[PDB]
Write an enzyme that holds these catalytic residues in place. Structure first.
Site, PDB file in Angstrom:
ATOM      1  N   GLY A  27       5.010  71.612  38.380  1.00  0.00           N
ATOM      2  CA  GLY A  27       5.671  70.414  38.482  1.00  0.00           C
ATOM      3  C   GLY A  27       5.019  69.472  37.664  1.00  0.00           C
ATOM      4  O   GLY A  27       3.563  69.459  37.567  1.00  0.00           O
ATOM      5  N   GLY A  29       4.858  64.911  36.981  1.00  0.00           N
ATOM      6  CA  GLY A  29       5.543  63.589  36.885  1.00  0.00           C
ATOM      7  C   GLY A  29       4.631  62.633  36.294  1.00  0.00           C
ATOM      8  O   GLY A  29       3.684  62.833  35.551  1.00  0.00           O
ATOM      9  N   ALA A  30       4.596  61.291  36.807  1.00  0.00           N
ATOM     10  CA  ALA A  30       4.108  60.207  36.036  1.00  0.00           C
ATOM     11  C   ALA A  30       2.754  60.345  36.330  1.00  0.00           C
ATOM     12  O   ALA A  30       1.814  59.514  35.438  1.00  0.00           O
ATOM     13  CB  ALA A  30       4.682  58.860  36.461  1.00  0.00           C
ATOM     14  N   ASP A 164       1.749  66.531  50.005  1.00  0.00           N
ATOM     15  CA  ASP A 164       2.454  65.640  49.387  1.00  0.00           C
ATOM     16  C   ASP A 164       2.249  65.593  47.984  1.00  0.00           C
ATOM     17  O   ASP A 164       1.008  65.149  47.497  1.00  0.00           O
ATOM     18  CB  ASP A 164       2.011  64.144  49.777  1.00  0.00           C
TER      19      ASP A 164
HETATM   20  C1  LIG Z   1      -2.399  64.498  53.739  1.00  0.00           C
HETATM   21  C2  LIG Z   1      -1.184  64.356  53.239  1.00  0.00           C
HETATM   22  C3  LIG Z   1      -0.269  65.224  53.417  1.00  0.00           C
HETATM   23  C4  LIG Z   1      -0.663  62.825  53.529  1.00  0.00           C
HETATM   24  C5  LIG Z   1      -1.398  64.345  51.643  1.00  0.00           C
HETATM   25  C6  LIG Z   1      -1.494  65.340  50.785  1.00  0.00           C
HETATM   26  C7  LIG Z   1      -1.782  64.615  49.470  1.00  0.00           C
HETATM   27  N1  LIG Z   1      -1.911  65.420  48.294  1.00  0.00           N
HETATM   28  C8  LIG Z   1      -1.360  66.659  47.846  1.00  0.00           C
HETATM   29  O1  LIG Z   1      -0.861  67.360  48.985  1.00  0.00           O
HETATM   30  N2  LIG Z   1      -1.907  67.057  46.732  1.00  0.00           N
HETATM   31  C9  LIG Z   1      -1.705  68.111  46.320  1.00  0.00           C
HETATM   32  N3  LIG Z   1      -2.320  68.568  45.254  1.00  0.00           N
HETATM   33  C10 LIG Z   1      -1.839  69.801  44.856  1.00  0.00           C
HETATM   34  C11 LIG Z   1      -1.135  70.541  45.780  1.00  0.00           C
HETATM   35  S1  LIG Z   1      -0.976  69.385  47.157  1.00  0.00           S
HETATM   36  N4  LIG Z   1      -1.474  63.431  49.742  1.00  0.00           N
HETATM   37  C12 LIG Z   1      -1.637  62.376  48.845  1.00  0.00           C
HETATM   38  C13 LIG Z   1      -2.212  61.204  48.993  1.00  0.00           C
HETATM   39  C14 LIG Z   1      -2.423  60.284  48.115  1.00  0.00           C
HETATM   40  C15 LIG Z   1      -1.531  60.252  46.898  1.00  0.00           C
HETATM   41  C16 LIG Z   1      -1.792  59.049  45.937  1.00  0.00           C
HETATM   42  C17 LIG Z   1      -0.815  58.240  46.256  1.00  0.00           C
HETATM   43  O2  LIG Z   1      -0.595  57.572  47.303  1.00  0.00           O
HETATM   44  O3  LIG Z   1       0.270  58.026  45.267  1.00  0.00           O
HETATM   45  C18 LIG Z   1      -0.862  61.162  46.820  1.00  0.00           C
HETATM   46  C19 LIG Z   1      -0.751  62.225  47.725  1.00  0.00           C
HETATM   47  N5  LIG Z   1      -1.241  63.112  50.957  1.00  0.00           N
END
Ligand SMILES: CC(C)(C)c1cc(NC(=O)Nc2nccs2)n(-c2ccc(CC(=O)O)cc2)n1
Ligand SMILES: CCCCCCCCO[C@@H]1O[C@H](CO)[C@@H](O)[C@H](O)[C@H]1O
Ligand SMILES: CCCCCCCCO[C@@H]1O[C@H](CO)[C@@H](O)[C@H](O)[C@H]1O
Length: 335
Positions: A27, A29-30, A164
């Protein structure tokens, strides 16, 4: 310092520790891109996310720091956790790239419902795990905001982690779609309701073609706002406009869920409430009779509180970058 190797993946050079092998893009994205990989040091299948130009802009830098901080904080069986974070940089002055490593699990919930619906017993186990993870996330004063099947990672035994990665609107609470002055964690319960419905029926609950269609479909199942909810909408013209999105009375809710467990339908009715103040919480839902086979009030842990001040911070890129660097070098892998 581990030994790193370089390779071209998704149009950039990925430089990762040699323990990580068989990197395969899954996957992009930006904000970055993700490869599936095998961690030869742990024998685990992993996801490796390389952030895209993490310190290009204030927003990129803030999101980088937020993601690292959040993932470092999350220590729960049903929430994705940080297995590793690394940079090839040897100092802050050369620090330019950030990589995050998590469990892969192997699949998501976006898959399983294509050919047929899941059994009630299976849905019990899946939704129980989502709610258990969500109780934890909410207890840290974190709102997910984008719960959907593609953000739910599952292994072959249907053990589940919420993630996420960082169709699109089908699981979104209506108040997010309508730019409410503020919203709160109750938005995620709406999303769980949509997910649960889909697992039980094998079909998307609210497959809107666009923004207005989405809202019309929602209003057709749960009904036009009642008197109590209408008081919470300031604009007379907005309330007038709403009253045009329905032409018939609301349907029998249970008609969507033929032959379903009555306890499943009761829970769904409590999640899919238009007025967010009236939705069941994650903790309350865990105690619902639907989950009797799984519920253990002593094994549904909560999170240490999280310093979320940084979500509203207006900082210089170099500050976000330094803060991020500190978090990278201080990382200790889970036992
Ligand atoms: C803890 C929970 C589920 C809320 C969560 C999990 C993740 N990240 C995540 O899963 N990363 C992965 N990498 C590889 C596989 S899974 N974020 C998350 C937090 C901040 C931002 C930046 C924004 O805010 O844009 C993006 C994502 N939040
Ligand atoms: C589709 C047209 C009607 C949408 C109504 C959605 C109402 C959502 O619920 C609202 O959520 C807000 C944000 O948390 C709260 O401040 C309100 O008290 C609550 O009523
Ligand atoms: C169904 C499409 C029409 C939606 C009309 C309702 C729009 C609600 O509008 C919302 O009302 C809230 C409460 O007053 C405000 O806090 C939000 O800022 C506003 O966007």
């Amino acid at each position: 310092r581990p030994t790193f190797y370089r390779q071209e993946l998704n149009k950039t050079i990925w430089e990762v520790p040699e323990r990580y092998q068989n990197l395969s893009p899954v996957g992009s994205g930006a904000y970055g891109s993700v490869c599936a990989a095998f961690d030869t040091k742990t024998g685990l299948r992993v996801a490796v996310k390389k952030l895209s130009r993490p310190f290009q802009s204030i927003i990129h830098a803030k999101r980088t720091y937020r993601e690292l901080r959040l993932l470092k904080h999350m220590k729960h069986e049903n929430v994705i956790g940080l297995l590793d974070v690394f940079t090839p940089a040897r100092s802050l002055e050369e620090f330019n790239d950030v990589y995050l490593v998590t469990h892969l699990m192997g699949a998501d919930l976006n898959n399983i419902v294509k050919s047929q619906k899941l059994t009630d017993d299976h849905v019990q186990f899946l939704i129980y795990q989502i709610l258990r993870g969500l109780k934890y996330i909410h207890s840290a004063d974190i709102i997910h905001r984008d719960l959907k099947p593609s953000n739910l990672a599952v292994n072959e035994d249907s053990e589940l982690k919420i993630l996420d990665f960082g169709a699109t609107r089908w699981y979104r609470a209506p108040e997010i779609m309508l730019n409410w002055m503020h919203y709160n964690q109750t938005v995620d319960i709406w999303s769980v309701g949509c997910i649960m419905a889909e697992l039980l029926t094998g079909r998307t609950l609210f497959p809107g073609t666009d923004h207005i269609d989405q809202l019309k479909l929602i209003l057709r199942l749960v009904g036009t706002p009642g008197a109590e909810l209408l008081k919470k909408i300031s604009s007379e013209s907005a309330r007038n406009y709403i009253q045009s999105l329905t032409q018939m009375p609301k349907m029998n809710f249970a008609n969507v869920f033929i032959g379903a467990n009555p306890l499943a339908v009761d829970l769904l009715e409590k999640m899919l409430v238009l007025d967010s103040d009236k939705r069941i919480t994650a903790a309350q839902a865990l105690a619902h009779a639907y989950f009797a086979q799984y519920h253990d009030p002593d094994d549904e842990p909560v999170a240490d509180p999280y310093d979320q001040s940084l979500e509203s911070r207006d900082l210089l890129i170099d500050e976000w970058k330094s803060l991020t660097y500190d978090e990278v070098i201080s990382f200790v892998p889970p036992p």
